[PDB]
Amino acid sequence: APKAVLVGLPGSGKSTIGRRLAKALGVGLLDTDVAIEQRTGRSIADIFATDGEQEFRRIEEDVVRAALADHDGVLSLGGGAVTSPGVRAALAGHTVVYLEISAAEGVRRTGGNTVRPLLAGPDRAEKYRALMAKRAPLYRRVATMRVDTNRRNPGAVVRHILSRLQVP
Numbered sequence: 396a397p398k399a400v401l402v403g404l405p406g407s408g409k410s411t412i413g414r415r416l417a418k419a420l421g422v423g424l425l426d427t428d429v430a431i432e433q434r435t436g437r438s439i440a441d442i443f444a445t446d447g448e449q450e451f452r453r454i455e456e457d458v459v460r461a462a463l464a465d466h467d468g469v470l471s472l473g474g475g476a477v478t479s480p481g482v483r484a485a486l487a488g489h490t491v492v493y494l495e496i497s498a499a500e501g502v503r504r505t506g507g508n509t510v511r512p513l514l515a516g517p518d519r520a521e522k523y524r525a526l527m528a529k530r531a532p533l534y535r536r537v538a539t540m541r542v543d544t545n546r547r548n549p550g551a552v553v554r555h556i557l558s559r560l561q562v563p
């Protein structure tokens with residue numbers, strides 16, 4: 396089972412925090428998006444575009460559930476995984492770190508050329524705010540630790556996480 400599971404919007408720092416946490420803990424990082432691509436032989440973009448979000452979510456839930464059983468390192472979940480009830484259920488009992496980010500900073504961090512089916516222009520900020528509004532209670536419901544990634548540089552967020560993982 397993972398030492399920690401990271402959840403949060405695109406742009407919250409899952410990749411960067413997950414790599415730095417994994418290194419600090421002496422374990423590997425598993426990103427469920429990557430796992431999906433590996434198990435399907437398909438890009439995430441392709442799954443959304445051809446088969447649709449609903450089929451993606453069932454796929455994702457399967458992979459997340461497997462990863463929670465089988466991965467012993469740091470697990471990073473795709474931003475929308477917590478929209479699946481079965482994901483939220485499977486997270487019960489785990490250490491779950493919610494990376495919280497303002498809409499302004501999250502938007503800024505997602506404005507590159509990564510393909511993001513649910514966060515494309517135009518009006519990407521409106522889309523980001525709508526994802527944040529919808530998913531915030533869901534992140535909160537599953538989280539065991541909540542961490543602000545706003546401004547705070549990554550090194551310091553990781554330090555804060557390790558500290559909170561360790562003490563009562």
Ligand SMILES: O=C(O)C1=C[C@@H](OP(=O)(O)O)[C@@H](O)[C@H](O)C1
Pocket residue numbers: 403404405406409428439472473474475476510511512513
């Ligand atoms: O927000 C979402 O619903 C999604 C987030 C992505 O994960 P990251 O947060 O790792 O980019 C990926 O699973 C897919 O594009 C759907």
